[PDB]
Write a protein that holds these residues in place. Structure first.
Motif, PDB file in Angstrom:
ATOM      1  N   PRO A 141      17.379  42.046  11.213  1.00  0.00           N
ATOM      2  CA  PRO A 141      16.846  41.013  10.323  1.00  0.00           C
ATOM      3  C   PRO A 141      17.865  40.513   9.304  1.00  0.00           C
ATOM      4  O   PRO A 141      17.820  39.338   8.954  1.00  0.00           O
ATOM      5  CB  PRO A 141      15.708  41.732   9.628  1.00  0.00           C
ATOM      6  CG  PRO A 141      15.195  42.655  10.664  1.00  0.00           C
ATOM      7  CD  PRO A 141      16.398  43.129  11.412  1.00  0.00           C
ATOM      8  N   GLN A 142      18.757  41.375   8.832  1.00  0.00           N
ATOM      9  CA  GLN A 142      19.803  40.946   7.912  1.00  0.00           C
ATOM     10  C   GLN A 142      20.696  39.916   8.572  1.00  0.00           C
ATOM     11  O   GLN A 142      20.924  38.846   8.018  1.00  0.00           O
ATOM     12  CB  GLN A 142      20.635  42.142   7.463  1.00  0.00           C
ATOM     13  CG  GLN A 142      21.392  41.930   6.167  1.00  0.00           C
ATOM     14  CD  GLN A 142      22.616  42.814   6.067  1.00  0.00           C
ATOM     15  OE1 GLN A 142      23.325  42.802   5.064  1.00  0.00           O
ATOM     16  NE2 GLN A 142      22.871  43.590   7.115  1.00  0.00           N
ATOM     17  N   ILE A 143      21.203  40.229   9.757  1.00  0.00           N
ATOM     18  CA  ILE A 143      22.037  39.285  10.489  1.00  0.00           C
ATOM     19  C   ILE A 143      21.315  37.961  10.636  1.00  0.00           C
ATOM     20  O   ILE A 143      21.906  36.909  10.427  1.00  0.00           O
ATOM     21  CB  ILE A 143      22.366  39.799  11.903  1.00  0.00           C
ATOM     22  CG1 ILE A 143      22.582  41.305  11.908  1.00  0.00           C
ATOM     23  CG2 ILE A 143      23.604  39.124  12.452  1.00  0.00           C
ATOM     24  CD1 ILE A 143      22.802  41.871  13.293  1.00  0.00           C
ATOM     25  N   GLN A 144      20.035  38.007  10.982  1.00  0.00           N
ATOM     26  CA  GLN A 144      19.269  36.788  11.198  1.00  0.00           C
ATOM     27  C   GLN A 144      19.022  35.959   9.947  1.00  0.00           C
ATOM     28  O   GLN A 144      18.919  34.742  10.028  1.00  0.00           O
ATOM     29  CB  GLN A 144      17.940  37.113  11.874  1.00  0.00           C
ATOM     30  CG  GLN A 144      18.052  37.480  13.340  1.00  0.00           C
ATOM     31  CD  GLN A 144      18.846  36.472  14.145  1.00  0.00           C
ATOM     32  OE1 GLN A 144      19.722  36.841  14.922  1.00  0.00           O
ATOM     33  NE2 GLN A 144      18.540  35.194  13.966  1.00  0.00           N
ATOM     34  N   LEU A 145      18.916  36.602   8.792  1.00  0.00           N
ATOM     35  CA  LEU A 145      18.733  35.869   7.546  1.00  0.00           C
ATOM     36  C   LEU A 145      20.014  35.149   7.184  1.00  0.00           C
ATOM     37  O   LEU A 145      19.982  34.082   6.583  1.00  0.00           O
ATOM     38  CB  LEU A 145      18.285  36.800   6.420  1.00  0.00           C
ATOM     39  CG  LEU A 145      19.186  37.083   5.217  1.00  0.00           C
ATOM     40  CD1 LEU A 145      18.759  36.246   4.024  1.00  0.00           C
ATOM     41  CD2 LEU A 145      19.149  38.562   4.867  1.00  0.00           C
ATOM     42  N   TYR A 146      21.148  35.715   7.571  1.00  0.00           N
ATOM     43  CA  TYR A 146      22.416  35.070   7.299  1.00  0.00           C
ATOM     44  C   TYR A 146      22.680  34.003   8.336  1.00  0.00           C
ATOM     45  O   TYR A 146      23.379  33.035   8.062  1.00  0.00           O
ATOM     46  CB  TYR A 146      23.521  36.108   7.197  1.00  0.00           C
ATOM     47  CG  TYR A 146      23.377  36.948   5.949  1.00  0.00           C
ATOM     48  CD1 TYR A 146      23.184  36.352   4.714  1.00  0.00           C
ATOM     49  CD2 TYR A 146      23.402  38.329   6.006  1.00  0.00           C
ATOM     50  CE1 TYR A 146      23.038  37.111   3.570  1.00  0.00           C
ATOM     51  CE2 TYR A 146      23.264  39.095   4.868  1.00  0.00           C
ATOM     52  CZ  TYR A 146      23.081  38.481   3.654  1.00  0.00           C
ATOM     53  OH  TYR A 146      22.938  39.239   2.519  1.00  0.00           O
TER      54      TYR A 146
END
Lengths: 664, 664
Positions: free
Chosen positions: A519-524
């Motif tokens: 999810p972190q990668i996707q928020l960025y």
């Protein structure tokens, strides 16, 4: 908001990252922390006792060799092991999780150059041209990676050694019969409907109570074991009040040590009792089974074929690796699953309402601290709620009823994506404003929809800049420090250890955490894609995150993190789809941006973009996605024939029979 | 627009319907029209020569027995044959097509009562209450019918006699190989991947040229056969100019009779030539085959399983009945299919632009004629474009590349639904206005989106009232008259007949026409559902259509229409989904209606309605839909075992081998 203050906060966060790296160097040099810093090596049997032999030096005696490579040499070493070697070292799951960071670099680097050659120098019709180019590039790269990951998955599945899941399916919702038991029903069904290649089956029992009792016994035997073996005789009889446990010396329960040995023995008595009423009772047997087949081709057939006229009965799906199976959720009725998902969907709305506000508060705190100059404090506080959210989302997924850890992690990642979409767009400042806009949203002027919403919906770029620097830079550097597992093992090998040799091993550092890391990668990806045609400022910071996270996570995948399951990249369709969502969101917001800075002269192309993206997505969902959901029958047959040639005499029955019994 | 004029036009249309019924009575009494009025009976061998024996009386000698049952007795007789008897008489397809008319009565009758007890008497919050009730009822009825039709389909499939499609699959996109022919590729693939139950295969050849040549020969031999056998020797040598043919005595081509016997023989010479270059050439062989299996279970497995890593290669799907197979489209590459669909999708936008305007014009014409009082003329003109549209949409579907008549008819019905949605909503008056709003839509004030559109988008109820009365009342009555097949056979049995006994049989009246009839039902479902919470006036007229069409089509299904294929109700998911669309459209328009007559106080419930409908749709798509797309493996095995017990010695190879050769 000015570049001066931005650079100041960047410098602070860069220093914080370097500070984390410096402490990491020191602690990784310590021979007594090696267990929780090179865990994978001990798990693979490639490293001996902690300090490659154990009980040596390298601690505070020499501190950290004063230089630059003292805390930076782990970086090029992480980027040294070949990718194929990492597939056999860690797994395909971890290797393709790393590929998402590389995908981000492969997308946002070219588009940063494009945006820094069009926006900042010659600042609209360029906006639409850029948006088009950006989407085309992202989509091209997404397709290329879908292909590579699909091929890697298929190569991995073909080379994979015999795993019990390759021959088994999970039949769910086996219709109840007055005269036949679930076992007999299953056997008879698959002996008449899949006669040629049905081998054996393993009915799912509800050994949830038994499992909990056995786990409680272990906890109870090791609860005050530290105290029991502190000095034997009569030690400190702590009293964890029975309402939250924990505590200690607060209630009135003293009894004996080892968490009241009487209670431990009572748990054992209950274990025996439950065992009888869970093995020989036939009511524990759930309407589900694990049907094994003689061939992988037969299991493929069963998994991808409908069995009965009722499509909600005899639901056969590929079984998960016996270690991936989340056994507690296998004892949940199918009818309940539907309602549980709905209940958790509406609880998730409440959860989004919940965390947005504290996240905003902590972001404001960070801003204030930076302006004044702790930044480390800001980090750890934001890190704090960002370690509760994954846990809440995971328990929500467990309630929903997914019977595999892989699927639970994937569902939690999808939920987290919605949280991150909401917290950055609709409900970012609306639901982030203490009082004010929250209640104004639900109670303002009649209608007022694209007025309260339309006006600057996606927050501001400057605030997001600080987010990358704090969570994406210093955050991933804190990951390399591995503080939590260190503390845990420290307070276990000196506390409740009582091992004969190497049985008390709390060095296991779990896995990458797809439910959190992804999810972190996707928020960025979101931030990057949405702001790309608007402001080119976010891209530089996003790129640093991707590179830093690639190397920190590569290090952790090779040295620490150990996979708890192997999905062979089965989560990639989800990753792909989330980047496609970011693309669509970006184009929709550019339709709004160029719907106000405009004359509908750009609208025909601004509305073509989403359709092109959805069309591409559907092509990728029809070309590459089927490799992740279904096992091709040709592939299954090839593996079967090759295996029956290498080992012309194998007893698959023995291997498959008790592979799917509840661990207890 | 007043009830006075509405009743006047209703009376006109009721009289027109009765007039059609009166002429129908007369013509059905004529012994020489019986061939094209009771066609199904001759096709079933239950009726002898035209007048149940042929060459009798009952014509103008007694005209039509002066009474009321002279032209109304066919109605209760149509509603006399049991439904199960109609399943074996006509087929399941026709029986469930009739069920759509009954579904309309089962939905719009209760909701008419509700709307005539709430709207007209006590005329808003009642609007939302009604909308809710209406949707709940429609959905309940939709689910009940989905269930019944699913059960009927499964019972029909189980009882069905051995058809070649039950054992065969159509493998498409067979990858080309330099060393192996398509036949060898297919054989080897299915002998290694489906070894246990692979029987035979039939590679698809491109015998399209040959087919056309053979058909041209038949046309050429019967073109001036009437003239050839008018008086032999040298008759009227008509000259159909070579640009459109037809004509006659207009060009300069006289030659011989029988459409220039030399040209007929030249076609035969070309037939022979092409035969050689289509049978023994290996380039005609397309990358597709019809793989037959020893069991239906094996074919089911193959159809519902992925075969290779490339999900766009070796695409195996259930084969259609050899008579349903549209052979020309089997010679179209798979890559072309995608582009062809896109091309036809954008050509369909152009087509919607095309017919909306003439439809509006003819509706205005009808209105004017009614006000002045021909209504019959109005009917036949609207009927006229409504017989061109199905044809255009069908040719568009053939271009798209569907290899089965069933799917072609289903696609054309879906396209027609979009045309009917557009022509009644977005582009109803916008694209219907000569000049004015058409070009204003594409060229008006900046933005102006929910202003030009939002304001009264769904037309007006009064105009729609006239539509039902003309197309749904008088239109279905014209269907019973069967004028076109009558004329055709009349000008064939006295013209180009030349039969030895009963070979020239142009009595075949085709089928119900799913590509035309069903879209009509769906447009009335649309009108009914959308206007229901607003105005209760449309419902009465819609109900009459449903009842009238039920009885007229029941009569035609039992007496005239003969099925050209048997899909066993495979089109029902499409029908269901189109009624769900109508529901959603209705709720969206009620959100707009109660978004202006309101205070967002009804909005929370107005936005819950669509979600509930979509949730129900997804339940029905997961419970009942799988019965129409996949053959359950248990069902397949049951049929197989029963058949292998009844006939323990069957040569399935012989039956399946040449069942899938191109008819030529």
């Amino acid at each position: 908001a000015t570049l001066k203050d931005i650079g100041v906060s960047a410098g602070i966060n860069i220093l914080t990252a370097f500070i984390f790296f410096i402490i990491f160097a020191f602690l990784r040099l310590q021979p007594f922390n090696d267990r929780v810093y090179f865990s994978k090596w001990y798990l693979r049997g490639l490293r001996s006792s902690p300090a490659s032999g154990g009980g040596f030096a390298g601690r505070f005696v020499n501190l950290e060799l004063r230089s630059y490579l003292k805390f930076l040499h782990w970086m090029p070493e992480a980027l040294k092991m070949p990718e194929r070697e990492l597939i056999d070292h860690a797994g395909l799951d971890s290797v393709v999780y790393l590929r998402i960071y590389w995908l981000g670099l492969k997308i946002f680097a070219p588009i940063a150059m494009l945006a820094w050659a069009v926006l900042v120098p010659v600042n609209f019709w360029a906006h639409i041209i850029m948006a088009y180019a950006f989407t085309i590039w992202t989509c091209y790269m997404l397709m290329k990676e879908y292909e590579t990951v699909a091929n890697m998955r298929l190569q991995f599945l073909a080379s994979e050694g015999r795993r019990p899941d390759q021959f088994t399916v999970l039949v769910r919702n086996v219709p109840p019969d007055p005269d036949e038991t679930v076992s007999e029903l299953v056997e008879h069904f698959f002996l008449v409907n899949h006669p040629d290649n049905y081998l054996t089956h393993q009915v799912v029992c509800n050994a949830n109570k038994l499992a909990d009792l056995v786990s409680k016994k272990t906890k109870l035997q090791n609860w005050l074991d530290y105290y029991q073996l502190k000095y034997t005789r009569n030690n400190s009889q702590i009293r964890p009040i029975t309402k939250l446990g924990c505590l200690g010396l607060c209630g009135q329960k003293v009894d004996a040590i080892e968490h009241y040995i009487a209670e431990v023995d009572k748990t054992s008595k209950e274990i025996a009792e439950e065992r009888e009423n869970v093995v020989n009772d036939q009511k524990s047997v759930m309407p589900a089974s694990f049907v094994s087949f003689k061939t992988r081709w037969a299991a493929a057939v069963c998994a991808q074929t409908t069995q009965t006229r009722n499509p909600t009965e005899w639901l056969t799906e590929w079984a998960a690796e016996p270690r991936d199976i989340y056994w507690p959720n296998l004892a949940i009725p199918y009818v309940s699953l539907t309602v549980r998902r709905l209940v958790m969907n509406v609880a998730f709305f409440f959860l989004t309402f919940f965390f947005i506000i504290p996240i905003a508060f902590v972001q404001s705190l960070a801003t204030i601290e930076g302006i004044e100059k702790q930044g480390l404090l800001a980090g750890i506080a934001l890190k704090l709620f960002l370690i509760f959210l994954p846990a809440i989302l995971m328990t929500m997924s467990k309630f929903e009823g997914f019977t595999s850890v892989s699927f639970l992690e994937r569902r939690s990642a999808s939920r987290y994506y919605i949280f991150n979409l909401v917290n950055v767009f609709l409900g970012s400042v609306i639901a982030g404003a203490a009082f004010e806009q929250l209640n104004s949203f639900l109670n303002q002027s009649p209608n007022q929809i694209p007025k309260t919403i339309g006006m600057a919906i996606p927050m501001k770029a400057t605030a997001f800049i600080t987010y990358i620097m704090v969570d994406g830079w210093a955050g991933v550097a804190g990951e390399i420090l591995m503080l939590k597992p260190l503390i845990i093992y420290h307070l276990k090998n000196a506390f409740l250890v009582k091992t004969e040799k190497d049985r008390e091993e709390a060095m296991n550092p779990g896995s990458i955490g797809f439910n959190t890391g992804e999810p972190q990668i996707q928020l960025y990806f979101l931030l990057g894609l949405v702001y790309a045609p608007v402001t080119p400022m976010l891209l530089p910071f996003i790129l640093v995150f991707f590179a830093l996270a690639y190397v920190v996570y590569r290090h952790q995948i090779i040295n620490v993190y150990n996979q708890e399951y192997e999905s062979a990249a089965a989560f990639w369709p989800d990753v792909h789809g989330r980047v496609i969502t970011a693309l669509i969101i970006s184009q929709l917001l550019l339709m709004g941006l160029l719907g106000t800075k405009h004359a509908a002269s750009a609208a025909p192309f601004l509305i073509a973009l989403p359709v092109i993206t959805i069309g591409f997505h559907r092509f990728c969902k029809g070309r590459f996605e089927p490799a992740f959901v279904r096992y091709p029958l040709q592939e299954a047959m090839m593996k079967d024939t090759l295996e029956r040639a290498r080992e012309p005499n194998l007893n698959l029955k023995g291997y498959l029979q008790d592979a799917y019994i509840h661990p207890v």
